[PDB]
Design a protein around this ligand. Sequence first.
Ligand SMILES: C[N+](C)(CCCS(=O)(=O)[O-])Cc1ccccc1
Length: 460
Amino acid sequence: GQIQISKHVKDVGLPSIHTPTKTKLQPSVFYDIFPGSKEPAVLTEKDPRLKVDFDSALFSKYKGNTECSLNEHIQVAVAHYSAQLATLDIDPQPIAMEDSVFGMDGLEALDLNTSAGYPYVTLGIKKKDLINNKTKDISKLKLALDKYDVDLPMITFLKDELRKKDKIAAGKTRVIEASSINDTILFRTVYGNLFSKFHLNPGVVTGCAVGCDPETFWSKIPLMLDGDCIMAFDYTNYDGSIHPIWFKALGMVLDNLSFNPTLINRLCNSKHIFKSTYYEVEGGVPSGCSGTSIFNSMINNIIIRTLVLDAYKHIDLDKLKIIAYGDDVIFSYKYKLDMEAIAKEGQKYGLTITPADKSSEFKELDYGNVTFLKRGFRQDDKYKFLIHPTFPVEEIYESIRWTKKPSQMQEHVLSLCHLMWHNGPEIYKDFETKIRSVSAGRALYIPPYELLRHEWYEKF
Ligand SMILES: C[N+](C)(CCCS(=O)(=O)[O-])Cc1ccccc1
């Protein structure tokens, strides 16, 4: 990520975007019932919990781009992965706008709650003002499309969420570049079929997990990654470390499929508006963007193949199975491979790869300690072939202590329970007890472990 130009919105003819300065998160009635350290992320330069300057650390993700071009290995990576995707027979033609908005098979309907982005956010216009899902009317949407066109700047929002104390004093708050609904629609009409195909085919052919249901997909992973092992690792600032060449490679893949190879460049050479500053970035991917999960996974698919070929000879790509969800990736090879060595091949590209789960060194992993989409793996008691997706109990305790909407505690709780029960009867029972220890939690409906277990078996 290299900031090319930065200037006042007034000197460019753009409005100043107003962003929430204070968190909506507040202590819930369970705050004292469960243990936790996390707290609301810093949303303003003036937060006593700070140590370093806000704007400083905030815009530190942009280290710039490392000098490097396309090599034969990347070309080979692109070639193999393309051939893999070619087996899915994806239709290159665009999709009707009616499908881009209300969805189709494999493509969820557009979220009508999130902001419409620029410039609607500055005109008081929301998505439900352009789309009438009630009568499926989108006439007003079409007008807006032709009125403001496309390739509009992205709005930078600070991510109001829970973070560890060290991220609080360090002012490390995550940003969420919000694309204009106009560009979300364009990207869906163009790539819609690809997005659809991927969502219906999470696995090793697409090398992607976007669209999967962890509850059933977890049982499949072990069968797909049928290798001599299983590897995972962490990325230090993945989004801001994606060098432009990966987009060039992504384009080639898309071109081998007969899709637009240039549109995606609007993500590489992106336009942004933080608050009163307008700027353009060269390199990196827009964090939290609308439809970038799939593109990020594809890039990772190209990266993994490259680093492997870079670190080893006599490698058989067909034997390297990959499953990615954006920057999160797990893969395997017929034979054992050194993760540390693979990691070092990333340095030349500007990718900082560290041990999985913020570990000390690059230690060997197994389905016993490996994680993916922040979930571990645990065999079911009754049926050993079914795999429980385990979510960190600590994270659940952390989440339940805060709430953004008090009158929605029932919904919040239910979500947690669906994650929780996968950790076991004893743990779930203790969770239920703590909740029901206060009148407010007693009035809540908590799904019994038997009911959750029963419903889970019927999903296979
Ligand atoms: C994926 N397996 C089929 C074999 C993995 C052997 S290992 O425990 O050494 O990673 C089953 C499995 C084993 C433990 C946990 C979750 C799944």
